[PDB]
C-alpha cells in the first residue's frame, strides 16, 4: 500500500479543519443537523490524520536536529486539533437542538466573511460546468463548501463535481461576492470571468 508523505497528511488536515469551521458556521446559520453531523465526522478524520502524522513524524526522526524539526510539525498539528475540536463544539450545539440567540445567525450573515445559500436556476450559465472547470474560489471569490442536491448533501465537493439546475450551493465569501454569485446562479449575469 502506497505510503503518504507527512506533507500530504498535513495538507489534508489543514484543508479539512478549514472546511470544518465553515461547515460548523453553516450548521448554525441553517440550524442543520446533517451539516452538524458532517462536522463531527470530519473531527474523526482529523484525529485519524493526526495519528498518521504522529506515526510518520516519529519514524522520520533519528537524530536530534531531525527530532527538533518534526516537533514543530507536531506542534502545529496540535493547534489544528484544537481548532478542529472547537468546530466540533459548535456543531454539537446544533445537534443538541438548542434555541440559538438570534444574533448568532445575524453575525454569521454580517461578518467580513459570511456563509450564504445560493440557488442555481436552469438558465444559469454555470449549469453543466464542473467545479474543477469553474474553480469558483478563484474566479468569483466565493468558496463552495457544500452542495444540497435534492435530499442529499455533497460536502467539500471536488473538481469532478458538476453543477446542476436546482442545486443549492453553500458558499463562503464576502457579502458582495455572495450577492454576485446569486445573480449568476439566477441567470441575470450571463458572464463569468
Using CB under 5 A, which residues numbered 1 to 40 contact Cl ion? Answer: 5, 7-8
Q: Which of 45, 92, 105, 164: binder of Cl ion (CB under 5 A)?
A: 164
Does the annotation flag 81 for ligand binding? yes
- Pick 91 or 120: Cβ nearer Na ion: 120
Does the annotation flag 47 for ligand binding? yes
**Contacting residues for 71 by C-beta, under 8 A, at least 6 apart:** none
- Pick 5 or 72: Cβ nearer Cl ion: 5
Binding flag, residue 165, Cl ion (CB under 5 A): yes
Which entry of Na ion, Cl ion, none binds 111, CB below 5 to 8 A by partner kind?
Answer: none
Q: Which residues are annotated as a binding site for Ca(2+)?
A: 47, 58, 61, 81-82, 151, 166
Q: Which residues bind Cl ion (CB under 5 A)?
A: 5, 7-8, 164-165
Amino acid at each position: 500500500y502506497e505510503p503518504k508523505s507527512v506533507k500530504e497528511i498535513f495538507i489534508e488536515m489543514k484543508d479539512t479543519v478549514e472546511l470544518m469551521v465553515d461547515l460548523a458556521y453553516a450548521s448554525l446559520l441553517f440550524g442543520d443537523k446533517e451539516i452538524a453531523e458532517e462536522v463531527l465526522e470530519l473531527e474523526e478524520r482529523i484525529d485519524l490524520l493526526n495519528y498518521q502524522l504522529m506515526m510518520h513524524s516519529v519514524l522520520a526522526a533519528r537524530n536530534v536536529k531531525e527530532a527538533e524539526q518534526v516537533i514543530t510539525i507536531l506542534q502545529i498539528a496540535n493547534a489544528i486539533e484544537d481548532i478542529s475540536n472547537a468546530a466540533g463544539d459548535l456543531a454539537k450545539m446544533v445537534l443538541e437542538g438548542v434555541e440559538l440567540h438570534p444574533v448568532i445567525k445575524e453575525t454569521i450573515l454580517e461578518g467580513e466573511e459570511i456563509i450564504g445559500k445560493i440557488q442555481v436556476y436552469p438558465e444559469s450559465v454555470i449549469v453543466g460546468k464542473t467545479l474543477g472547470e469553474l474553480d469558483l474560489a478563484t474566479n468569483t471569490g466565493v468558496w463552495i463548501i457544500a452542495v444540497r442536491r435534492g435530499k442529499r448533501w455533497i460536502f467539500g465537493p471536488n473538481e469532478n463535481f458538476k453543477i446542476r439546475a436546482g442545486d443549492v450551493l453553500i458558499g463562503r465569501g464576502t457579502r458582495t461576492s455572495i450577492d454576485h454569485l446569486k445573480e449568476i446562479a439566477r441567470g441575470a449575469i450571463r458572464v463569468i470571468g
